Every structure is written in structure tokens, then in C-alpha cells.
Amino acid sequence: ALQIPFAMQMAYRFNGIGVTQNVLYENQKLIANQFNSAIGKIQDSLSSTA
Amino acid sequence: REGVFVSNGTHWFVTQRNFYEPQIITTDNTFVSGNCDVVIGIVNNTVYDPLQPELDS
Numbered sequence: 431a432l433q434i435p436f437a438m439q440m441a442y443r444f445n446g447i448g449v450t451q452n453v454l455y456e457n458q459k460l461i462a463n464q465f466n467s468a469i470g471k472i473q474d475s476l477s478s479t480a
Numbered sequence: 481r482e483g484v485f486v487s488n489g490t491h492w493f494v495t496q497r498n499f500y501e502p503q504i505i506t507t508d509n510t511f512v513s514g515n516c517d518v519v520i521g522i523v524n525n526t527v528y529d530p531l532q533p534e535l536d537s
């Protein structure tokens with residue numbers, strides 16, 4: 431394992447889908463809030479939807 | 481452009497992800513976008529512009 435900061439791992443991950451990595455850094459709080467909220471929807475989905 | 485910005489503690493280099501090969505940071509190695517106020521954890525350094533000393537000479 432090689433450590434790397436998570437916002438730099440996401441720049442590799444964006445560049446791997448052809449989205450240029452400055453599109454992460456210029457939107458990092460939006461991308462974080464969308465991810466955190468999407469994990470939230472999985473808790474509610476799994477809690478409700480037997 | 482490809483690879484990562486890295487420092488040995490005193491100097492900043494770009495290098496490719498999977499094999500340490502430090503290169504001077506330049507307008508050929510890097511692309512601009514926006515400005516300093518937008519990005520979390522950006523660092524100050526010079527960027528060498530390889531055209532400039534040729535025009536100066």
C-alpha cells in the first residue's frame with residue numbers, strides 16, 4: 431500500500447474517466463457533499479426496504 | 481498533466497505515478513485552471529516557463 435491524500439486519489443479516479451482533474455478540485459466540497467448524502471440514502475434505503 | 485507534485489522537503493518536482501523520476505515543474509509539465517482561492521491545500525512555488533530564457537537571450 432502506498433499512502434495518498436484522498437482528494438488526490440479522487441483526482442486519479444476522475445482522470446481515469448476522462449474528466450480533467452481540476453474538475454475535482456474546483457468542486458471538491460460539492461463532490462464530498464454528494465458522496466456523503468449518497469451514503470446517507472443507502473442507510474435509509476437499507477433501513478426501510480426489506 | 482500526468483503524474484503528481486512531490487517535494488523532497490526543500491524543492492518541488494512533478495513525477496510519474498508508478499516510478500519516482502523527479503522533473504522540474506514547468507508550463508510544459510502542467511496546465512492552468514482558475515486561481516489559488518478555489519483549491520484546498522494548494523502550495524506556493526515557482527513554475528519555470530521554458531520559452532522565457534530563449535526570448536530573453
Ligand SMILES: *[C@@H]1O[C@H](CO)[C@@H](O[C@@H]2O[C@H](CO)[C@@H](O)[C@H](O)[C@H]2NC(C)=O)[C@H](O)[C@H]1NC(C)=O
Nearest residue numbers: 486487488489490491492493494501502503504
Ligand atoms: C531536493 O532536491 C534538490 C535537487 O536535487 C537538492 O538541491 C541540490 O542539492 C545539491 C547537494 O545535494 C546541490 O549541489 C545543488 O546545487 C542543489 N540544487 C538546487 C537547485 O538547489 C536538494 O538538496 C534536495 N533536498 C533534500 C532535503 O534532499
Ligand SMILES: *[C@@H]1O[C@H](CO)[C@@H](O[C@@H]2O[C@H](CO)[C@@H](O)[C@H](O)[C@H]2NC(C)=O)[C@H](O)[C@H]1NC(C)=O
Nearest residue numbers: 515516517518519520521522523524525526527
Ligand atoms: C502564497 O503566497 C501569497 C503571496 O505571494 C500569499 O498571499 C498573501 O497572504 C497573506 C496572509 O494571508 C496576506 O496578508 C496577503 O495580503 C496575501 N497577498 C496576496 C497578494 O494575496 C498566500 O497566503 C500564500 N499561500 C500559501 C498557501 O502559502
Ligand SMILES: *[C@@H]1O[C@H](CO)[C@@H](O)[C@H](O)[C@H]1NC(C)=O
Nearest residue numbers: 435436437519520521522523
Ligand atoms: C492537513 O491537516 C492539518 C491538521 O492535521 C491542517 O492543519 C492542514 O491545514 C491540513 N492541510 C490540508 C492540505 O488539508
